[PDB]
Amino acid sequence: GKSPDSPQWRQHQQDVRNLNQYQTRGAFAYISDQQKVYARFFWQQTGQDRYRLLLTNPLGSTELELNAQPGNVQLVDNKGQRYTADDAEEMIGKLTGMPIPLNSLRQWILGLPGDATDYKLDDQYRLSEITYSQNGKNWKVVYGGYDTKTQPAMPANMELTDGGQRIKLKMDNWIVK
């Protein structure tokens, strides 16, 4: 599609990186061979290192909440018990049994490529596809629409595939500033 060597792609990244707070909510799906999980999620990020993730099952009951600031990383589970750790990704993986690429996702959910070099853009000069390998995990990210009600526009539908496992994200809407 469009070339990464384009002023509009740089402008889009700039606008996204210039935001100080991001907020979205929607549906989440983790599908592997061992389990198929569904949930609604609330995501809030302030800056590049402070964020909050809230998950509720399809029945409406909250399942867990992850809060993170540099150094302090907290998670509250179904039983309302609070666990602390120093790494959000590791903790999520360990406490839920799912290898969610949280670090990479914090960039990708925003329409940014993170540390990924292999990626493509659509005709609107926005990320459409990413290919990233890290620690034996070759994730294939595919964007399926953006929500242009905000400027800059933010991802509406995302697909992540790591061989046998697949992550699906559906954003209802965004609030940014």
Q: Is the peptide bond before 4 cis (omega within 30 degrees of 0)?
A: no
* CA 103 – CA 107 distance, rounded (Å): 7
- Compute, in degrees rounded to 10, the torsion defined by CA atoms 143, 154, 88, 81: -110
> Are the C-beta atoms of 50 and 69 separated by less than 8 Å?
yes
* CA 107 – CA 60 distance, rounded (Å): 27
Q: In terms of DSSP H, where are the helices of the chain? A: 7-18, 88-96, 102-108
Handedness of CA 51, 57, 61, 63 (dihedral sign): negative
Total domain count, the chain:
1
The CATH number given to whatever domain includes residue 26 is 2.50.20.10
> Are the C-beta atoms of 2 and 121 separated by less than 8 Å?
yes
Q: What residue numbers bound the domain in which 94 lies? A: 1-177
DSSP letter (8 states) at residue 58: T
* CA 151 – CA 67 distance, rounded (Å): 26
Q: In terms of DSSP H, where are the helices of 49-122? A: 88-96, 102-108
Q: Which amino acid is at 63?
A: E
Closest CA to 151 of 126, 176, 125, 128: 176
State residue 64 phi and psi, 5-degree precision: -170, 165
State residue 137 phi and psi, 5-degree precision: -130, 110
What is the token pair recorded at 172? 């209802």
Stated resolution in angstroms: 2.2
